[PDB]
Amino acid sequence: PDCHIRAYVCH
Amino acid sequence: VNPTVFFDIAVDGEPLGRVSFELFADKVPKTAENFRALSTGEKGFGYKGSCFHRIIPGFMCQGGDFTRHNGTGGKSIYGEKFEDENFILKHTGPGILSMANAGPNTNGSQFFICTAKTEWLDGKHVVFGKVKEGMNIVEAMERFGSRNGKTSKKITIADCGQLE
Ligand SMILES: *CC(=O)Nc1ccc(NC(=O)C*)cc1
């Protein structure tokens, strides 16, 4: 459940 | 009154300090109750002994995998997953407690403690609590983090429960 990190990396 | 839970944090088995949290049961009761019961262990499983598997300085500390200890596990007290209860509360700054997920309606046990305002998470992750005391302990945890979250020392919830 790493959606919040994926958002962070792409951002 | 909103419940208060605590984590006693250890670094490679040595006590670091206590973090306590107010859980916003008045606004997200189902999500708050999940975290509360996982903090006491009263269902036979929960956060005690688990590790903070991703610590990203300036962003958040993530934990809650007590079923696989590999960053992919965890489960709620309602079953494997539960629905996003609401998005009333926003990621307003350091200390916010919010649910990790893999998409809509996939809440389990994994959570993160924000160390900054993260408004770009609003509407995607359910906010359900905040650090009450021990933000200095959360900052101490940040010092062990890295770019993508792997930790330089083992950061554990050595004990956890619910305060009076
Ligand atoms: C659930 C999930 O995987 N979320 C997510 C958010 C952002 C991104 N990447 C970008 O926005 C560029 C991927 C996945």
Numbering used by the authors:
A (entry chain B): 1 to 11
B (entry chain A): 2 to 165
The authors write:
To assess the ability of Helicons to bind and modulate the function of enzymes, we screened the cyclin-dependent kinase CDK2, involved in the regulation of the cell cycle, and also the peptidyl-prolyl cis-trans isomerase Cyclophilin A (PPIA), which binds non-α-helical peptide substrates and catalyzes the cis-trans isomerization of proline residues. Peptidyl-prolyl cis-trans isomerases (PPIases) are a family of enzymes that recognize a diverse range of proline-containing polypeptide substrates, and are targets of the “trimerizer” natural products CsA and Sanglifehrin A that bind PPIA to form ternary complexes with the proteins Calcineurin and IMPDH2, respectively. A Helicon screen for PPIA binders afforded a pair of shifted clusters that competed with CsA both in the phage screen and in in vitro biochemical assays. Cocrystal structures of Helicons from both Clusters C53 and C54 confirmed that they bound the site ordinarily occupied by peptide substrates or natural products, providing a second instance where the screening platform was able to identify an α-helical binding solution to a site ordinarily recognized by peptides in a non-α-helical conformation. A PPIase assay showed that these Helicons inhibit PPIA activity, as expected given their orthosteric binding mode, demonstrating the ability of Helicons to directly block enzymatic function.
To target disease-causing proteins that are inaccessible to small-molecule or antibody therapies, we are exploring the use of a nature-inspired drug modality that exploits the intrinsically favorable properties of synthetically constrained α-helical polypeptides (Helicons). Here, we report a rapid, high-throughput screening platform utilizing phage display that enables an unbiased mapping of the α-helical interactome of a given protein without any prior knowledge of its structure or known binding partners. Analysis of 14 high-resolution crystal structures of Helicon–protein complexes across six different protein domains reveals a range of binding modes, all of which are “side-on”, i.e., mediated exclusively by Helicon side-chains rather than involving main chain amide interactions. Biochemical and structural experiments demonstrate diverse functional impacts by the Helicons which bind these sites, including inhibition of protein–protein interactions, inhibition of enzymatic activity, induced conformational rearrangement, and induced dimerization.
